[PDB]
Amino acid sequence: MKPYQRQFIEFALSKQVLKFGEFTLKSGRKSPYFFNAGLFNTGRDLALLGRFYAEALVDSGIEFDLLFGPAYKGIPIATTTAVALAEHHDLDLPYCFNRKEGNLVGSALQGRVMLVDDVITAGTAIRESMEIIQANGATLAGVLISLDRQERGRGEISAIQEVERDYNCKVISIITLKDLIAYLEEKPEMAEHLAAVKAYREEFGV
Amino acid sequence: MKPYQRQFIEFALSKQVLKFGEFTLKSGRKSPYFFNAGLFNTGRDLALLGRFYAEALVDSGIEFDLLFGPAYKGIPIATTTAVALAEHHDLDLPYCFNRKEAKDHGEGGNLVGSALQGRVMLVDDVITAGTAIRESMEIIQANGATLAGVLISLDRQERGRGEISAIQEVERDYNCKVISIITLKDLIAYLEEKPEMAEHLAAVKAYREEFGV
């Protein structure tokens, strides 16, 4: 994996954003790991989070004109990613976000939009933000999230896979389940988690 | 004024956030200038904005435990100010903001970020009325937290419906200090620096005479 991906995992771990154990997801699924970006709640967390998102964004090579952050979770993320791009990548990009109720804040919603969010659970918000992006004649360049759980949804494919299908766009993620596994495989003391995770992947993966 | 203040003024000018002319204010008055932080709509604008806010905050020397940004305007400002403090001042501070309604699917309520506790530094763009901070205050008080101060971009330093300015009501009503990066006084001092701004200096000085303080 890329250094920034490894750093993200270790940073998420230190902040208890990523926890290895046994947790019950809101789907009855017993997962051996939990991710909650909502725990990145201080200035330094935000600063670094913004750096990681910016890294994944620029590394993807996807062309976009503005960053859109869905209310409410997407707002601080879009904000920090925007400042990170400006300060560490010399890219001054327009940002925008909506009011849940004009219901828009920031620059004019125009061009190729890069939607920024934490995670795609059911795709609901994505589908909602999309009605807005389309309503303004803007197009979806891609979606940028923290972690791609790479696990089946209610059907055959995963939520990320549904979003990409329905919108002919790419979903970029800082890390995926494969990255977590690769990381665990290096930590001997994590053997139990590695077994649990790999087991979980076999049952609900891709 | 300090260098960071003059810099903010020029920053605002270049981004058309601060405009000198003749505008019919929301209150009905005809003002010689116009300020609209909403025009800080790009990544770099945000980056610099956060850095000016952080500067004024640290320079104030006021003690606070967390930054609170009111939905919706306060959210990006609180966010960038928080990152600016971390990145440029080595201060890792908890931030928090509200949702204008409770989250149906959950137990989080109407708060996002760290637990709303301690001395809160409310961050916003401008205070155009004493009634503006009420929503935030109810939330701060409902959580057993206290208001350390309010941080805004510009203090228009002009009367409202009464004899005092909106900022003066907030400080009085909540017994707190409102910090601003710049005030009307700073704009005037700046206009005196630029010989081309002579007509603007004239219009502004007169406006302050009729509505100032």
How many residues are present in chain A? 206
CB contact, 8 Å: A62 with chain B? no
User: Which residues of A contribute to the annotated binding site for orotate?
Assistant: 34-35, 121, 149
- Distance set, CA B118 to CA A189, B70, B76, B92, B208 (Å): 39, 17, 22, 15, 38
Phi and psi (nearest 5°) for A32? -85, 5
- Among candidates A46, A39, A44, A47, which has minimal Cα distance to A13? A39
Residues of chain B in contact with residue A73, where contact means CB-CB under 8 angstroms, are: 112
* CB neighbourhood size of A137 (10 A): 9
Tokens representing B95? Answer: 């931030």
Determine which of A26, A83, A99, A110 to mutate to test the interface with B (most B C-beta atoms within 10 Å).
A83
Q: How far is CA B96 from the centre of its chain?
A: 16
CA distance A66 to chain B (A): 9
**Whole-number Å distance between alpha carbons of B159 and B145:** 30
Q: Are A72 and B99 in contact (CB under 8 A)?
A: yes
Active-site residue numbers of B? 103, 105
- CA A190-A184-A174 angle, 5° bins: 140
Contact flag A93-B41 (C-beta cutoff 8 Å): no
User: Which residues of A contribute to the annotated binding site?
Assistant: 26, 34-35, 72-73, 99-100, 117-125, 149
CA distance B38 to chain A (A): 7
Residue B132 DSSP label: G
Contact flag A96-B50 (C-beta cutoff 8 Å): no
Q: Is B100 annotated as a binding residue?
A: yes
Taking every pair of C-alpha atoms in chain A, what is the biggest distance, in angstroms? 54
Per-residue burial over A44-54, b = 16 or more CB atoms within 10 Å of its CB, e = otherwise: bbbbbbbbbbb
Tokens representing B66? Answer: 């967390």
- Checking A159-163 for CB contacts under 8 A at 24+ apart, the result is A159/A120, A159/A121, A159/A122, A159/A123, A160/A120, A162/A123, A163/A120, A163/A123, A163/A126
Sheet order of strands, B95-98 included: B111-113, B95-98, B66-69, B119-123, B146-155, B177-183
Tokens representing B79? Answer: 């966010």
> Could you tell me which chain B residue has the CA closest to the CA of A65?
B42
Q: Are A70 and A128 in contact (CB under 8 A)?
A: yes
CB contact, 8 Å: B71 with chain A? yes
Q: Which of B42, B99, B114 sits opposite A95 (nearest CB)?
A: B42
Phi and psi (nearest 5°) for A186? -95, -25
**Whole-number Å distance between alpha carbons of B20 and B205:** 13
* CB neighbourhood size of B137 (10 A): 19
- Among candidates B63, B64, B48, which has minimal Cα distance to B4? B48
Q: Are A12 and A18 in contact (CB under 8 A)?
A: yes
**Whole-number Å distance between alpha carbons of A60 and A64:** 11
Helix axes B184-191, B3-14, angle to 10 degrees: 80
B2: part of which helix (H) or strand (E)? none
Could you give the 3-state DSSP secondary structure of residue B31? strand
The CATH T-level fold of domain B1-213 is Rossmann fold (3.40.50)
Could you give the 3-state DSSP secondary structure of residue A125? helix
Q: How far is CA A188 from the centre of its chain?
A: 28
Which CATH number is associated with domain A1-206? 3.40.50.2020
Phi and psi (nearest 5°) for B141? -65, -40
Given in angstroms, what resolution was this structure solved at? 2.4
